[PDB]
Amino acid sequence: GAMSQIKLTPEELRSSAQKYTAGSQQVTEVLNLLTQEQAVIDENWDGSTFDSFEAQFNELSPKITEFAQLLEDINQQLLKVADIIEQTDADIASQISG
Amino acid sequence: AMSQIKLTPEELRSSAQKYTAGSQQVTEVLNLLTQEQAVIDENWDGSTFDSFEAQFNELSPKITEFAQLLEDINQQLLKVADIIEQTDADIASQISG
């Protein structure tokens, strides 16, 4: 099971996790910023010139939100797994006598 | 249809900069974490992480498309700013001359 299958240490799992949460946050910020820019362009440039970019942005936008959410979910899984593994090491050290 | 475009060339260019910067940032995150997904895959035997792998893989091409869209918007904003800037110059010269 996992104790056999996982080769990353708790520390390695935590270092990987940090990359995912930082990327989640960065993606969210980009999307939030450019959502505002899209609205500014829409309001301050009358007509249909950017209608196709508007539709494409709006179609992709929820995928970007999902991606940010996925990256954060992965951070949480890796942190939780790291804690379970670290406690396993401690429990073997305390409970096993060999 | 009004002809008026309320954003000035300078304003259009400031917005374009945000699109291309955002594009780069999204691509960097996808690059870094594509590589980290392969680390996890190689260092976690079996199928336990398979769903997170599938979820990442399904979204990845959309992320690449998004980053390209952002670059495309940048490019067209710069093009429109240049058209407007010439027009502004031609009107200013016409009125002053």
Numbering used by the authors:
A (entry chain C): 0 to 97
B (entry chain E): 1 to 97
What does the paper say about this structure?
WXG100 proteins are a group of proteins of approximately ∼100 residues in length that contain a conserved “Trp-Xaa-Gly (WXG)” motif. To investigate how specific sequence motifs translate into specific structural features, we determined the atomic structures of two representative complexes, the heterodimeric CFP-10/ESAT-6 complex and the homodimeric sagEsxA assembly. The overall structures of the two protein complexes are similar, with both forming a four-helix bundle, in which each monomer consists of a helix-loop-helix structural motif. However, the novelty of this contribution is that by using the iterative bio-informatics approach, we can show that the WXG100 protein superfamily can be divided into three subfamilies: CFP-10-, ESAT-6- and sagEsxA-like.
The sagEsxA-like proteins form a homodimer and the structure of the sagEsxA shows that the driving force for the interdimer interactions is principally hydrophobic in nature. At the inter-dimeric interface, hydrophobic residues are prevalent in sagEsxA-like proteins although there is a pair of hydrophilic residues Y18 and Q36 within the hydrophobic core of sagEsxA. The side chains of these residues form hydrogen bonds within the hydrophobic core of the four-helix-bundle complex (inset) and the presence of these hydrogen bond pairs between Y18 and Q36 is indicative of the anti-parallel homodimer arrangement found in the sagEsxA subfamily of WXG100 proteins. As a result, this conserved pair of mutations can be seen as a fingerprint of anti-parallel homodimeric WXG100 proteins. In addition, it contains a 310-helix with hydrogen bonds originating only from main chain atoms, whereas, the loop of sagEsxA (residues 43–48) consists only of a single tight β-turn. The CFP-10 subfamily is structurally more closely related to the sagEsxA than to the ESAT-6 subfamily. This is reflected by a root mean square deviation (r.m.s.d) of 2.07 Å for a superimposition of the core residues of CFP-10 (residues 11–83) and sagEsxA (residues 11–83), compared to an r.m.s.d. of 3.43 Å for the equivalent ESAT-6/sagEsxA superimposition. Secondly, by examining every WXG100 gene in its genetic context we could clearly show that all WXG100 genes from the Actinobacteria phylum are encoded in a bi-cistronic operon containing a CFP-10-like gene followed by an ESAT-6-like gene without exception, whereas, all the sagEsxA-like genes occur as mono-cistronic genes in the bacterial genomes belonging to Firmicutes. Interestingly, the sagEsxA FRET signal could only be detected after extensive heat treatment. This result shows that the homodimer is stable, and a FRET pair homodimer can only be reconstituted after heat dissociation.
